[PDB]
Write a protein that binds this DNA or RNA. Structure first.
Ligand code: MG
Ligand code: MG
Ligand code: MG
Ligand code: MG
Lengths: 246, 248
DNA sequence: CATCCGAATTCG
DNA sequence: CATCCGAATTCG
């Protein structure tokens, strides 16, 4: 009666120490052994690495132009049924919504990920993309459990500007009472991969789910351990979440 | 019967061709002979020049640190009564509100000018300053006619963001039906003093007046400072605004 | 003695 | 092969 998953922007666009960082991401995958992994900022060579070092995950992608998202499904645990790609017609960064329908146990899921439009200056487009995601979450068949997990790039004000989440969609971190230990998934004071001398902190990485049949049990940051090469696996922390279906 | 005035950011911060440009500004003052002139971005030497080349105007200033505003009063037409400076506590650019009470044509006026906080990213402070100005315009007794004219640096929606003009305060341009001939007072297409390649057009320079019972009615609004000087540059990067109003 | 537009870029 | 924060600066 459970699903566990990681969502993680793994910064494929950072060319520094990629082999070692991919190894570290694959270490987290082996150690935490989630059913599903949502990845953003993947690049082709990174896929090839996951194919050898996380071989028990099926990699589902849509378009692979430049950098992209992927959903990884644990073989034997998760059965793929179908995929759907929802475009963001006004994106300037090749962003979109990747949806995968799966079965895990006797439970049907619609798993979605995206990397929403980046940077402060593209707030209006990022908000339009969010609304597109939220609308698609609501369209899913009543019997299916919908989970979105991704790099939303959202900051102060924006979700409110959007009019807030609909009454049957919830943010897992909010649902769990806004625990302080995972309140930031991108934090330049704690993570120095970008060498930014300022301390800025954001909750860019978020999980939304439609529902009280679905109950988040835990949420934790992963990728917190600096690698021997002196770099974190990514500039983002990953999020590990377990949900119970009641 | 009337009042005429010019408001003009004369770009004292542009150090090139200042003497010819000052000569150009003084030419406009002689030719249009306004009762009052509201100037922004004045610098000390520029004041010195006006005292010689527009010597029939009394120059009224508040603080003179760096660059500043001034209000010029035509000697014999306008009688100075008093001045008041209202500070903008959160300014990072030494901006403030300069108010001068005067008598003109047997009528009493409170004339105000300011150079509101500059640049796009200082919208919040600029809006707070606008509120301060608009609030100050309501304080004078109804008998006194209140006129604000200055470089407001305002752009799209900022006035709405502020709650809009109160019901007894009007923008002279809007009042006159938004005439296209003087819409933009800062225009990089038509004015090349900053040599900006792009075409940006703004209405930074604005005139607000308090009416109530229609005792003050704008008659005309025109751009001044449109004539290129011998050096192939204009007096300022802004056009000035010449306005005439009837006291009814 | 300088600033000013604003999209792109730099740099802390 | 790159991006990414955000204030400050560059340059069209
Ligand atoms: Mg990145
Ligand atoms: Mg200037
Ligand atoms: Mg600037
Ligand atoms: Mg940037």
């Amino acid at each position: 009666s459970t699903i566990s998953f990681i969502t993680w922007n793994i910064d494929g666009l950072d060319g520094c120490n990629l082999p070692e960082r991919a190894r570290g991401v694959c270490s987290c995958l082996a150690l935490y052994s989630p059913d599903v992994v949502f990845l953003q900022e993947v690049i082709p060579p990174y896929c090839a690495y996951l194919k050898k070092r996380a071989a028990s995950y099926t990699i589902i992608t849509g378009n692979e132009e430049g950098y992209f998202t992927a959903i990884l499904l644990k073989k034997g645990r998760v059965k793929f049924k179908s995929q759907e790609i929802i475009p963001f017609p006004n994106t300037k960064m090749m962003r979109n919504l990747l949806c995968v329908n799966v079965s895990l146990g006797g439970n049907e899921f619609c798993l979605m990920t995206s990397h929403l439009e980046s940077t402060r200056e593209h707030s209006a487009e990022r908000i339009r993309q969010l609304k597109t995601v939220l609308g698609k979450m609501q369209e899913a068949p009543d019997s299916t459990t919908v989970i979105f997990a991704g790099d939303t790039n959202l900051r102060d004000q924006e979700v409110i500007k959007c009019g807030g989440l609909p009454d049957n969609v919830f943010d897992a971190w909010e649902f769990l009472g806004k625990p302080k230990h995972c309140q930031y998934t991108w934090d330049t004071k704690a993570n120095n991969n970008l060498r930014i001398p300022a301390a800025y902190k954001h909750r860019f990485d978020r999980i939304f789910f439609r529902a009280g049949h679905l109950i988040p049990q835990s949420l934790d940051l992963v990728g917190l351990e600096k690698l021997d090469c002196g770099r974190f696996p990514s500039d983002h922390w990953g999020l590990l979440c377990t949900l119970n279906v009641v």
